[PDB]
Ligand binder design. Structure first.
Ligand code: HEM
Ligand code: HEM
Ligand code: HEM
Ligand code: HEM
Lengths: 139, 145, 145, 139
């Protein structure tokens, strides 16, 4: 990412803070309702509204994204283990990362309408695209 | 194909949409987030930076006409291939726009509805609109098939 | 959507296709080149290496059914939505296969025809076959739209 | 790219050799016929069969791919100027890098029957996808 991109992402995710996991859970829920082809990857989950399993997984995703922002300059070594999990073991179709990235943007917009400028929208999209490239890099 | 309680939440939320601003908002964000789309719009003038694009009189004007085509599609959700026949011909035979771009504009609109409507834009509301924007996208791309 | 000299080149080359082997070589190549697709064929057995996939007898057997479905498409080029309405339901509502993967199998089919016909698989012939595969992928995607 | 993919790419591309320029001209011709939306980028070319200009541009595309093969480990710096041309100046829609990559695979399949195994097919797709990732990295 460019210098301006780094600044807009760190700033936006700074002002997410403790809400990180709550936001992650909402993005998974928006994903499961809008794109029903993604429910097949979680047969061992209660995918009903308010589900405790979705809340706990929400926080795991959020914490993975917080590490990514904190290691923006060395992203393939901050997410190395999750490419193995996502590509080799689970065989997650690459389109699905684009569906989660989009629901994660619809969440940041509904909750942070003051920070969700068109320039910050563009910075977060390149950031989630980069995260998506690293997690599909074992294909 | 929308359920009665989907079609009623879709139509309910639209009546509260500032038809003037949201259209320009949606078209402006597409040109800044996916900059390759700017080459279709050279005659609109200065798209050099994010402020040049959002404050651009022709973008804001052209956005009213886009949102206005979205407004006519909701009314006729049972005949989109018909409503959008003339725009399909324009976009696919004259302009040569890749159908992937129809989906991206649909997805940028959803992000913008979420920006304005906040907590009123619920995950089940979003799933109903994601059905609308895909249906629009496929109606526009029919002249390629 | 095929000129008269297109439809005649398409048909002429298809008649020379080894119906026993091409469908298995195409399905086998989808699974090796795009490995996420292997999760839908879990019960076909050993897909652990490239050599396991190509010689896997369930892959060859199912490869003949896929090619059969394409022959049926070529015979009904003017009504593809109607010929594939049952297969579309299987792939879209039961199996939950993303429509992008339909384009990938069609493009892999086009690579395999070029492997087998070399010099005969001229650019004009390839362009007639691309329209067909696009035709078939859009018909299999109909139950989403 | 994995060491096995590097060996497979070098094997295949070694056998192309002196005909690389001819093959690049065939790929461009196959793309204009199959995906006629790609022609909007060459309004200043004669795009008839055997056009001097398409042959000329075939050699430029091929010489760049050979460079990319000789620098597989530092692709981002070998192609950085081409990344600027195609994103910044030309504004090429990323979907178009997938149509030219497919037309290259079809050209190699038709000329190198013995060399175009499943294993080699897969390694070449990864390589062409790697080249497309760099050329669209200013987005
Ligand atoms: C930005 C994108 C993504 C990130 C950052 C991410 C991150 C993670 C993390 C951190 C885990 C848990 C690792 C652990 O156990 O410690 C995980 C598990 C998982 N992810 Fe993702 N993920 C992403 C996208 C996706 C998508 C799009 C899918 C499917 C549509 C998916 C499916 C899964 C599945 C099935 C699991 C395992 C659940 C279980 O069995 O416990 N991921 N992901
Ligand atoms: C997805 C929904 C879309 C809708 C509903 C839509 C709708 C329209 C409408 C109503 C017009 C004006 C037609 C007229 O009054 O003559 C138009 C023109 C145009 N659209 Fe779209 N469009 C969409 C997507 C796109 C995309 C994705 C692009 C480019 C990336 C695009 C590029 C254009 C261009 C270049 C014009 C002509 C402007 C001019 O020179 O006057 N459209 N569109
Ligand atoms: C143009 C593309 C395709 C055609 C023409 C096609 C055709 C067929 C046909 C004829 C069947 C057998 C129907 C039956 O026996 O009831 C079938 C089954 C199936 N297809 Fe496809 N298919 C296509 C693409 C795909 C893709 C991309 C996938 C997965 C990535 C897929 C996954 C399956 C599965 C899982 C089955 C069921 C296998 C079983 O019997 O256990 N198909 N397809
Ligand atoms: C693997 C993919 C590609 C490679 C390696 C490649 C390589 C090149 C090279 C080496 C040049 C010459 C630059 C110069 O004169 O210094 C060039 C120019 C160009 N490329 Fe590409 N290119 C690729 C894909 C594409 C695609 C997909 C398009 C459009 C669909 C495209 C459109 C152009 C155009 C318009 C020019 C400029 C032509 C001119 O003004 O003379 N390229 N490319």
């Amino acid at each position: 990412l460019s210098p301006a991109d780094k600044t807009n992402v760190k700033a936006a995710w700074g002002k997410v803070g403790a809400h990180a996991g709550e936001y992650g859970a909402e993005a998974l829920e928006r994903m499961f309702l809008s794109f029903p082809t993604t429910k097949t990857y979680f047969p061992h989950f209660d995918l009903s509204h308010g589900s405790a399993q979705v809340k706990g997984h929400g926080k795991k995703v959020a914490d993975a994204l917080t590490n990514a922002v904190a290691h923006v300059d060395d992203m393939p070594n901050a997410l190395s283990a999750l490419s193995d999990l996502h590509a080799h073991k689970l065989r997650v179709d690459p389109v699905n990362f684009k569906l989660l990235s989009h629901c994660l943007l619809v969440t940041l917009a509904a909750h942070l309408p003051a920070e969700f400028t068109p320039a910050v929208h563009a910075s977060l999209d390149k950031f989630l695209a980069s995260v998506s490239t690293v997690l599909t890099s074992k294909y | 194909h929308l359920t009665p309680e989907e079609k009623s939440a879709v139509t309910a939320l639209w009546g509260k949409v500032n038809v003037d601003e949201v259209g320009g908002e949606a078209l402006g964000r597409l040109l800044v987030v996916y900059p390759w789309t700017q080459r279709f719009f050279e005659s609109f003038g200065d798209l050099s930076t994010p402020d040049a694009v959002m404050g651009n009189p022709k973008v804001k004007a052209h956005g009213k006409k886009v949102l206005g085509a979205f407004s006519d599609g909701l009314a006729h959700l049972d005949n989109l291939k018909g409503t959008f026949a003339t725009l399909s011909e324009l976009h696919c035979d004259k302009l040569h726009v890749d159908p992937e771009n129809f989906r991206l504009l649909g997805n940028v609109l959803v992000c913008v509805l979420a920006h304005h409507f906040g907590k009123e834009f619920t995950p089940p509301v979003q799933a109903a609109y994601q059905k609308v924007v895909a249906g629009v996208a496929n109606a526009l791309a029919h002249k390629y098939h």
